[PDB]
Amino acid sequence: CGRFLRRLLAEESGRSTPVGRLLLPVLLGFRLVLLAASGPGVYGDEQSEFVCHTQQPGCKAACFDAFHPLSPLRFWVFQVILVAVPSALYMGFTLYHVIWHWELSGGAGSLRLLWAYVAQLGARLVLEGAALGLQYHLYGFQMPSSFACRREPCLGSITCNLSRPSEKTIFLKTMFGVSGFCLLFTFLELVLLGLGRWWRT
Amino acid sequence: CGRFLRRLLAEESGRSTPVGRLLLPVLLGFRLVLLAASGPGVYGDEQSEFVCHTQQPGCKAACFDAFHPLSPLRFWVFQVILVAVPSALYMGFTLYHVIWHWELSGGAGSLRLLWAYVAQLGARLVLEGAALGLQYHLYGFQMPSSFACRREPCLGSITCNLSRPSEKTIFLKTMFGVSGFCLLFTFLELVLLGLGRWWRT
Amino acid sequence: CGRFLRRLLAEESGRSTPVGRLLLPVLLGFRLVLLAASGPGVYGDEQSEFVCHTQQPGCKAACFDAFHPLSPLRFWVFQVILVAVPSALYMGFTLYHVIWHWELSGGAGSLRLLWAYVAQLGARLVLEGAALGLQYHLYGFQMPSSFACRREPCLGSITCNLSRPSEKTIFLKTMFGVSGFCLLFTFLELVLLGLGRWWRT
Amino acid sequence: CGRFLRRLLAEESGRSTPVGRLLLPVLLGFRLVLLAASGPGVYGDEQSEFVCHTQQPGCKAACFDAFHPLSPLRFWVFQVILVAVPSALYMGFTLYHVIWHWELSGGAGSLRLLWAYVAQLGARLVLEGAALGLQYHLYGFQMPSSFACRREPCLGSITCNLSRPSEKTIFLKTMFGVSGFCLLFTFLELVLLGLGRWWRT
Amino acid sequence: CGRFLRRLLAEESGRSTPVGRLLLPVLLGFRLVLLAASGPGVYGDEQSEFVCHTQQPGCKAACFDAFHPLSPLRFWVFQVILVAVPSALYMGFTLYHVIWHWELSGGAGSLRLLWAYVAQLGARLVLEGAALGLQYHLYGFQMPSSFACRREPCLGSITCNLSRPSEKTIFLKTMFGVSGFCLLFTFLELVLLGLGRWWRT
Amino acid sequence: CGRFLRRLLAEESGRSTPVGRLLLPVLLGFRLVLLAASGPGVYGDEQSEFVCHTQQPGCKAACFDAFHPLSPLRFWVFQVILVAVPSALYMGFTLYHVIWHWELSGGAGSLRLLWAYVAQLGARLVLEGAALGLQYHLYGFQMPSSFACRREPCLGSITCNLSRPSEKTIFLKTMFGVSGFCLLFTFLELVLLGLGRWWRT
Ligand SMILES: CCCCCCCCCCC(CCCCCCCCCC)(CO[C@H]1O[C@@H](CO)[C@H](O[C@@H]2O[C@@H](CO)[C@H](O)[C@@H](O)[C@@H]2O)[C@@H](O)[C@@H]1O)CO[C@H]1O[C@@H](CO)[C@H](O[C@@H]2O[C@@H](CO)[C@H](O)[C@@H](O)[C@@H]2O)[C@@H](O)[C@H]1O
Ligand SMILES: CCCCCCCCCCC(CCCCCCCCCC)(CO[C@H]1O[C@@H](CO)[C@H](O[C@@H]2O[C@@H](CO)[C@H](O)[C@@H](O)[C@@H]2O)[C@@H](O)[C@@H]1O)CO[C@H]1O[C@@H](CO)[C@H](O[C@@H]2O[C@@H](CO)[C@H](O)[C@@H](O)[C@@H]2O)[C@@H](O)[C@H]1O
Ligand SMILES: CCCCCCCCCCC(CCCCCCCCCC)(CO[C@H]1O[C@@H](CO)[C@H](O[C@@H]2O[C@@H](CO)[C@H](O)[C@@H](O)[C@@H]2O)[C@@H](O)[C@@H]1O)CO[C@H]1O[C@@H](CO)[C@H](O[C@@H]2O[C@@H](CO)[C@H](O)[C@@H](O)[C@@H]2O)[C@@H](O)[C@H]1O
Ligand SMILES: CCCCCCCCCCC(CCCCCCCCCC)(CO[C@H]1O[C@@H](CO)[C@H](O[C@@H]2O[C@@H](CO)[C@H](O)[C@@H](O)[C@@H]2O)[C@@H](O)[C@@H]1O)CO[C@H]1O[C@@H](CO)[C@H](O[C@@H]2O[C@@H](CO)[C@H](O)[C@@H](O)[C@@H]2O)[C@@H](O)[C@H]1O
Ligand SMILES: CCCCCCCCCCC(CCCCCCCCCC)(CO[C@H]1O[C@@H](CO)[C@H](O[C@@H]2O[C@@H](CO)[C@H](O)[C@@H](O)[C@@H]2O)[C@@H](O)[C@@H]1O)CO[C@H]1O[C@@H](CO)[C@H](O[C@@H]2O[C@@H](CO)[C@H](O)[C@@H](O)[C@@H]2O)[C@@H](O)[C@H]1O
Ligand SMILES: CCCCCCCCCCC(CCCCCCCCCC)(CO[C@H]1O[C@@H](CO)[C@H](O[C@@H]2O[C@@H](CO)[C@H](O)[C@@H](O)[C@@H]2O)[C@@H](O)[C@@H]1O)CO[C@H]1O[C@@H](CO)[C@H](O[C@@H]2O[C@@H](CO)[C@H](O)[C@@H](O)[C@@H]2O)[C@@H](O)[C@H]1O
C-alpha cells in the first residue's frame, strides 16, 4: 500500500492550494481535540451547578429547562459531524475513481474531480455560517450568574444561581473564534479558485 | 494486501449506484457516532430524574416501570446491530467468492452476487420500517413534564415530575429523521435496479 | 501476508457449508456486542435496586444473597468464553498445519482437519445445551416485582421490592433466543455433514 | 513480515508437544479475560460491603484490616504477571537467535533452545504451586457471612456482617480450578519430554 | 512503506542538529504524558476542595469564581495543542514535497524546506514565552491555604479553606520547569543555525 | 519493514550482554504494568480514608497536608518517565545512524554507538539511586494506623485514623524491591563491559 497511497494523495489534492491542503485539516482537528479533552470538564455538571432557592416540587426542573433547552456540548457534537459529511463523500468518490483507472492506465475524468471539490466547499460554507447564527441566538457571548424564573408550578418569582460563569464564558468565545477562522479560510479557498470571475458573469 | 483490496472493492460494488456505494455507508455511520457520543448524556440518568411526591414503599418503582418499560438507549442499540447483520453476511459471501476464483482466474458467478445484493436491501427495508413503527408506538414525538400514576401499592393518584423534557424531545426527533432517510435511500436503490419492471409483471 | 491469509481461509473452510462459514460467526458476534453495549445498563445496579422494609442489621444482605446467588452478567461472561475455547484450539491446529506443508508443498493431512472440525461442533453442542438448562433453572423467564424472605437474622417475614422488572424480563428472553439459534445451527451443520448416516449404523 | 513469522513459529515450537503448543496458551488467556471482565464486579466494593455495629472512632478500620490484609484482586494480578516473566524471556531469546542465523544460513544452536524451554517450565511449575498454597492459606474455600473482632480501639467484642458471600465463594473456587489445570498440564509437558528417564538416573 | 519512510525522515531532518532532532521531541512528549497521567488526580476536584464558612445562598460560587476564573488543567491543554500547530503544518508541507519529486527524481526545492523550519521555531518561541507569562500572572509559584473574599452577595468578609496546597504547589513548579527547558532548547537551535550572523546585519 | 527491523535490532544490541538485552526490558515492563493495574486500587482514595475526630473548620485539611505532601502514585509516575528519557534518546540516535549508512553501505561509526550505550546506563544508575533515597526519606517501610497532629487552626492535639495500613505497607515494599533489582542489574551490565579496568586506572 505504498504506491497506492502515493497516487491517491497526489490526485485528491492536485488542484487545491495550500490553504485547503494544509491549513484547513489542521484547523478542524484542533477543534475536535479541544472539545473532547476539555469540554466535559466545563459543561458536564450544569444540572447540579444550578441552585434555586425554593422547596416546591418541580420548580427547579421547570426553570432549568427554560434556561437551557439544549446544552452546548450537544450542539458542538452535531456541528463537527455534519461538517464532516461532505468531506467523507469526496474521499470515497476519489477512491473509486483511482481504482477504475489503474486497470487501463496503470479530460472527462480530471474535470470530474474539480466539480466535486467546489461542491463540498459550498456546502461547508453554508453549514458553518448557519451554526454560528444559532450559537449566538441560543447562548450569546456570556453566561450569567443569576436567572429569574416566572414559570409554573413556581409560586411568584424565584432566584437561581449558577457556578463557574467565568470559565464557561471563556470556552464559549474560544469556540466562536475557531469556527470563524474555519469559515474564513473556506471562503478564501473558493476565491483563489476563481469565484470572482464566476460571480460577475 | 494492496492488489487484494483493489479487487474486492471493485467486485463488491461493480453493480451498484452511487446511492448504495457512498451515501448509505455515510448515513449509517452518522447514526452510530451520534448515539455513542451524545446518547448517554441525555438518557443515562432517567431513573434519578423521575421524582414522585409520596413516601409509601414501592410506589416510585411501580410508576417508573409503567412509564418506561424499555429505555430508548436499549432500543437504538438493538436497531443498529440488527441492520448490520445482512451487511455482514454479504461481505463474507463476497470474500470467499474472490478467493475461489484467484487460483483459476488470477456468468454463473457474476450473477450469484447480484441476487445477494437485492436480498440484503429487502431485509434492511423490512427491519427499518418495523423499527420506526415501534418507536412511534412506544415513545411518540414528545416526552412530557408530568405523569399521573394509579397503580398498586400506591394509595390514590400521585403526581410525578420529569427533568429535561426539551432536550429529550429534540434528540428523539433527530433520530426519527436520520432513520427515515436511511429508509428512503434503501427503497430508492431498489428502484434504480429495476424494481418497477419486476413490480408490474 | 497476502498470499498466506488467502491460503488459510481456503483451508480452514474447504469442507464446511455456508451455515458454519457465514451464519455462525455472525450469530456469535451479535451476542457479544449486545452483552458489552447493553448489559451493564440493565443489571449493573441490582444491589441498590433491592429495597427491603426493615431496620435490623444484616437482614437485607441475607435476603439479597438468597434471591440472587449469581448475577446474570457473570453467567453470560463465562458462557461466551467457554464456547470460544474449542474454536481457538481449531484455529491454532490449522495454523501450524499450513506451515509444515509450505516448505515441501509450497490424504492423511486433509483427513486430519475434518476430524477436528467435527470435534469442536460436538463440544459446543454440549456446552450450549447445558448453559440453557442452568439459565432456566436459576432465573426462569420472568423477574418478579416482590420477594418474601424468611431468613435469619430477620425477625418474622419481610417484604422486599425490585426496580425495573419489565426491562430485565425483556433482556433475559432476548438472550435465551439468540443462544437457541446458535444451538440450532450448530446441530444443523452436523446433519449436513452426515450425522444421519453415522447415527443409524 | 510473512516469511519471518513463518520461521519463528516453526522454531519456537519445533520441539514441543500439542499440550504446550495449543492447550497452555489457551488456558492462560482464559484466566486473564475472566479476571479483567468479571473480577472488579465481585470484589471491587469490599470496603463498603463491610458493616460493623458500633460507633467508636476507628473500630471499623481496625477490624477490616485484620480480616483482609490483602484483597484477592491484588493477589491474582501479581500471579499472572509473575508467570509471564519466564515466557517473555524465552520469546526474546528465540527472536535474537533467528536473526543471527539468517545472515549466514538464510547442533550447538538447536540444542541451545531445548535447554531454555525446560528451564521456563520448571520455573512456572514452582511459581504456580506456591501461589495455590498462599491462596488456600489466606482465604480458604469459603467467604463467611459474619466476623467477630476483638481488637483495639474496639471496646468488647463486636459483630460485623458481609454482603454477597455466595457469589464471592463461587468466583474463588473457579480460579482455584483454572490454576490447578495450568499446573497439571505444565507438569505433564515435562514428563512427555523425558523427565521420567532423568528422574531415575 | 519501508523505502518511503526511510526517505521522509532523511529529508525532514537533513538540515537540523541533534538538539532539534532528538532532544525536543522527547521533551514535548514528556510534558504530554505527565499531564494526562497525573494532572486530573491533583486538580480534578478543586470545586469540592473549596470550603467556605457561611450559609448565605450563592456566596461560595461567587468566591470560587473570583479565586480561579480558569483552572490550570484547561490552560495546559490549550498550550500543548497550540505549540503542535506549527509542527503539524511543517510535516504536511514535507510530505507533499516528497511526492512531487518521486515521479521525476525517484536547489529551489532544498532551499524551500529550510525557510519553513526556521519559521515554525520562531512561532513556537513566541507561543512558549507568552504562555509562561500568563502562568506566572494567573497562578504564581504557590497555592495558598486560605482566601479572603469580600464579594456580593456575601455579607461582610468570610474565610475559605483549601485542601492539598503542598501537592498543587509541587506540580505547578514542575510544569514551569519543563516548559522553560523547551523554550531554552528552541532558542538554542536557532543560534546554531546562524541567528547570530543574521542578528548583527 | 522486514529487513529494516532485522538490521536495527542487530545494531542496537550487537555490543550488549543478555543482562541488558533480555532481563532489563522485562524488569522495567513489570514495574509499569503493576503500577497501572494495581496502583489506583490501593492509593486512590487516601483522602476519604483519613478520618480525624474534630469539628473545627479546616483542621482535617491541615493535618492531611502535613502527613502526605505528595502521594506515592505521583512519585512513581515521575520515576518511570524520567528513567525512560535516556532510553528514548539512544533509540533515536541509533535509528538515524542506520539510515545514513544504508545509502552507501546498503570504525568511527561502530565506536560511536558504544559510547552512547555507556552514557545512558550511567544516567539511569544515578536516577534510580536518588529515587530510592527519596522513597525511604518520604514514606519509609511502613504506613501507620494513627497520626498525631498539632497544627493550626486545630485547638490542642487531635487523633486521626487511617484505613488499610497493611495493604499499603505490602505494596510499598514490593516496589522498593523491583527498583532495587533494576539498580543491581544496571550496575552489573557496566562491570561486564569493563568498568573494573577503567576504575583502577
Ligand atoms: C440562523 C438564525 C436562526 C433563526 C432562529 C431559528 C429558531 C430555532 C429554534 C430554537 C429553539 C431550539 C431548537 C434548535 C436546536 C437544533 C439543534 C439540533 C442538535 C441536536 C443534536 C430554542 O428556543 C427558542 O425559544 C426562545 C424562548 O421562547 C428562547 O429564548 C430564550 O428564552 C428565555 C426564557 O425566558 C431565556 O431566558 C433567554 O435566554 C431567551 O430569550 C431561545 O432559545 C429560542 O429563541 C426552539 O426550542 C423549542 O423546542 C421545543 C422542544 O423541541 C421546546 O419544548 C416544547 O415546549 C415546552 C414548553 O415551552 C415544553 O416544555 C416541551 O415539552 C415542548 O416540547 C420549546 O419550548 C422551544 O424551546
Ligand atoms: C504576557 C503578560 C500577560 C499580560 C496580562 C494579560 C491579561 C489577560 C486577562 C487575564 C484574565 C483571564 C483571561 C485569559 C485566559 C485565556 C486562556 C484561554 C484558554 C481557553 C482554553 C484573568 O483575570 C485578571 O483579573 C484579575 C482580577 O481583576 C485577576 O487578579 C486576581 O484577582 C484577585 C481577586 O481578588 C485574586 O485574589 C488574585 O489572585 C489576583 O489579583 C487576574 O486573574 C487577572 O489579572 C481576565 O479574566 C476576565 O475574564 C472575564 C470572563 O472572560 C471575567 O468574567 C467577567 O466578569 C465577571 C465579574 O468580575 C463576571 O462574573 C463574568 O460574568 C464576566 O464574564 C472577568 O471577571 C475577568 O476575570
Ligand atoms: C409495528 C407496529 C407495532 C404493533 C404493536 C406491537 C406490540 C409490542 C409490545 C410493546 C411492549 C414492549 C415490548 C417490545 C420491546 C421489544 C424490543 C427488544 C429490544 C431488546 C434489546 C410495550 O407495552 C405495551 O403496553 C402498553 C400498556 O399496556 C403501553 O402503553 C403505554 O401504557 C401507559 C401506562 O399507563 C402509558 O402511560 C402510555 O405511555 C402508553 O399508553 C405501550 O408501551 C405498549 O402498547 C409490551 O410490553 C410488555 O412487556 C412485559 C415484559 O416483557 C411487561 O411486563 C409484564 O407485565 C408487568 C405488569 O404489567 C409486570 O410488572 C412484569 O413483571 C411482566 O413481565 C408488560 O407489562 C408489557 O409492558
Ligand atoms: C442442566 C440442569 C441443571 C441441574 C441442576 C444443577 C444444580 C447447580 C447448583 C445451582 C446453584 C448455583 C451454582 C451454579 C453456578 C455455576 C456458574 C459458574 C460461573 C462462574 C463465573 C444455585 O442454588 C440452587 O439452590 C436453590 C436454593 O436451595 C435455588 O433455588 C432458589 O431458592 C429460593 C430461595 O428461597 C429462591 O426464592 C428461588 O428463586 C429458587 O427456588 C437455586 O438457585 C438452585 O437450585 C447452587 O448454589 C449454592 O452455592 C453455594 C455457594 O457456592 C451457596 O452458598 C453456600 O450456602 C449458603 C447458605 O445457604 C452460605 O450463605 C454460603 O456461605 C455458602 O457458601 C449455596 O447456598 C447454594 O446457593
Ligand atoms: C537523596 C536523599 C534526599 C535528601 C533530602 C532531600 C529533601 C527534599 C525535600 C522533601 C519535601 C518534598 C519535595 C520533594 C518531592 C519531589 C518529587 C517531584 C515529583 C512531582 C511529579 C518533603 O518535606 C520534608 O519536610 C519534612 C517536614 O518538615 C517531612 O518530614 C515529615 O514531617 C512530619 C510532620 O510532622 C511527618 O509527621 C513525618 O512523616 C516526617 O518527619 C518530610 O516529608 C521531608 O523531610 C519538601 O516539601 C516541602 O514542600 C513545600 C511545597 O513545595 C511544602 O509546602 C510549603 O510549606 C507549607 C507549610 O509547611 C505550606 O502549607 C505550603 O503552602 C508551602 O508551599 C513544605 O511544607 C515542605 O513540605
Ligand atoms: C506456601 C505456604 C505458605 C506458608 C505461609 C507463608 C506466610 C506469608 C505471610 C502471610 C501474610 C500476608 C503477606 C503475604 C502477601 C504477599 C503477596 C504480595 C502481592 C503484592 C502485589 C498474612 O498474615 C498472616 O497472619 C495471620 C494473622 O496473624 C493471618 O491469619 C488470619 O488472622 C485472623 C485474624 O483474627 C483471621 O481471622 C483469619 O482469617 C486468619 O487466621 C493470615 O493472613 C496469615 O497467616 C502476613 O501479613 C502480615 O503483613 C503485615 C504487613 O506487611 C501486617 O501488618 C503489620 O502488622 C499490623 C499489626 O498486626 C499493623 O497494623 C501493620 O501496620 C503492620 O505493617 C501484619 O499484621 C501481617 O498481617
PDB file of C-alpha atoms in Angstrom, chain C residues 47 57 61 64-65 69-71 74 77-78 81 85 89 92-93 96 99-100 102, chain D residues 6 9 13 21-22 26 30 33 37-38 41 49 53 162-167 170:
ATOM      1  CA  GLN C  47     -27.898  -4.286  44.709  1.00  0.00           C
ATOM      2  CA  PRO C  57     -28.682  -5.186  60.976  1.00  0.00           C
ATOM      3  CA  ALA C  61     -27.737  -8.751  52.860  1.00  0.00           C
ATOM      4  CA  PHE C  64     -30.423 -10.482  48.533  1.00  0.00           C
ATOM      5  CA  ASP C  65     -27.992 -13.415  48.685  1.00  0.00           C
ATOM      6  CA  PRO C  69     -26.536 -16.079  44.438  1.00  0.00           C
ATOM      7  CA  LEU C  70     -25.112 -15.256  40.987  1.00  0.00           C
ATOM      8  CA  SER C  71     -25.826 -12.325  38.705  1.00  0.00           C
ATOM      9  CA  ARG C  74     -21.388 -13.185  35.417  1.00  0.00           C
ATOM     10  CA  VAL C  77     -19.474 -13.849  30.508  1.00  0.00           C
ATOM     11  CA  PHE C  78     -18.471 -17.403  31.437  1.00  0.00           C
ATOM     12  CA  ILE C  81     -15.524 -17.618  26.772  1.00  0.00           C
ATOM     13  CA  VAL C  85     -12.261 -22.451  23.718  1.00  0.00           C
ATOM     14  CA  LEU C  89      -7.889 -24.748  19.535  1.00  0.00           C
ATOM     15  CA  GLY C  92      -4.235 -22.959  16.077  1.00  0.00           C
ATOM     16  CA  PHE C  93      -4.182 -26.553  14.874  1.00  0.00           C
ATOM     17  CA  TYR C  96       0.623 -24.984  12.349  1.00  0.00           C
ATOM     18  CA  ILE C  99       3.303 -24.019   7.976  1.00  0.00           C
ATOM     19  CA  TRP C 100       4.562 -27.624   7.996  1.00  0.00           C
ATOM     20  CA  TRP C 102       4.570 -24.839   2.781  1.00  0.00           C
TER      21      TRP C 102
ATOM     22  CA  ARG D   6       6.604 -18.359   9.367  1.00  0.00           C
ATOM     23  CA  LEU D   9       6.720 -20.097  14.909  1.00  0.00           C
ATOM     24  CA  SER D  13       7.689 -24.842  18.755  1.00  0.00           C
ATOM     25  CA  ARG D  21       1.714 -25.561  21.792  1.00  0.00           C
ATOM     26  CA  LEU D  22      -2.099 -25.207  21.896  1.00  0.00           C
ATOM     27  CA  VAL D  26      -5.499 -21.021  25.670  1.00  0.00           C
ATOM     28  CA  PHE D  30      -8.847 -17.807  29.713  1.00  0.00           C
ATOM     29  CA  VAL D  33     -10.020 -12.463  30.337  1.00  0.00           C
ATOM     30  CA  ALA D  37     -14.083  -8.780  32.743  1.00  0.00           C
ATOM     31  CA  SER D  38     -15.674 -10.198  35.913  1.00  0.00           C
ATOM     32  CA  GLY D  41     -17.729  -6.564  39.793  1.00  0.00           C
ATOM     33  CA  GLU D  49     -19.834  -4.056  51.944  1.00  0.00           C
ATOM     34  CA  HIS D  53     -22.445  -2.418  64.511  1.00  0.00           C
ATOM     35  CA  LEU D 162     -20.668  -9.095  54.899  1.00  0.00           C
ATOM     36  CA  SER D 163     -22.556  -8.801  51.614  1.00  0.00           C
ATOM     37  CA  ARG D 164     -22.656 -11.303  48.748  1.00  0.00           C
ATOM     38  CA  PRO D 165     -20.823 -14.256  50.356  1.00  0.00           C
ATOM     39  CA  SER D 166     -22.237 -16.755  47.836  1.00  0.00           C
ATOM     40  CA  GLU D 167     -21.016 -15.010  44.677  1.00  0.00           C
ATOM     41  CA  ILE D 170     -18.134 -19.227  43.579  1.00  0.00           C
TER      42      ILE D 170
END
